[PDB]
From Swiss-Prot, chain A:
Protein name: Multidrug efflux pump subunit AcrB
Native species: Escherichia coli (strain K12)
Phenotype of the disrupted gene, per the record: Loss of susceptibility to contact-dependent growth inhibition (CDI); inhibiting cells still contact the target.
Subunit relationships: Homotrimer, with large domains that extend into the periplasm, interacts with AcrA and TolC. AcrA may be required to stably link this protein and TolC. Interacts with AcrZ. Part of the AcrA-AcrB-AcrZ-TolC efflux pump.
Inducers of expression: Positively regulated by MarA, Rob and SoxS transcriptional regulators (at protein level).
Subcellular location: Cell inner membrane
Length: 50, 50
């Protein structure tokens, strides 16, 4: 939902930026914060609404 | 000369110019630029052309 730039790849010989982030369609209204789960220490996938 | 007649070891000798830290020989100094994509290689082939 907020981007994050991990580190630098290289584009035809010009160092450039690299960013992880959500495809637009999975970040547009509050009900999408419904899609992200998050692995716990038991490996069980737990969702924010929790 | 005396250092020619030496094994695979180019060994030159030469007198420094008037103003060490200054514009040397009446020679030129040219720089071939990558000006796009073209990798190391391409420039090399380029360099080698000229």
């Amino acid at each position: 939902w907020g981007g994050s730039y991990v580190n630098d790849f290289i584009d035809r010989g010009r160092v450039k930026k690299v960013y992880v982030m959500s495809e637009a369609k999975y970040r547009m209204l509050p009900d999408d914060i419904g899609d992200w789960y998050v692995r716990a220490a038991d490996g069980q996938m737990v969702p924010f609404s929790a | 000369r005396a250092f020619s007649q030496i094994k695979d070891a180019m060994v030159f000798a030469f007198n420094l110019p008037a103003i060490v830290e200054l514009g040397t020989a009446t020679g030129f100094d040219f720089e071939l630029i990558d000006q796009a994509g073209l990798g190391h290689e391409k420039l090399t082939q380029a360099r080698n052309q000229l």
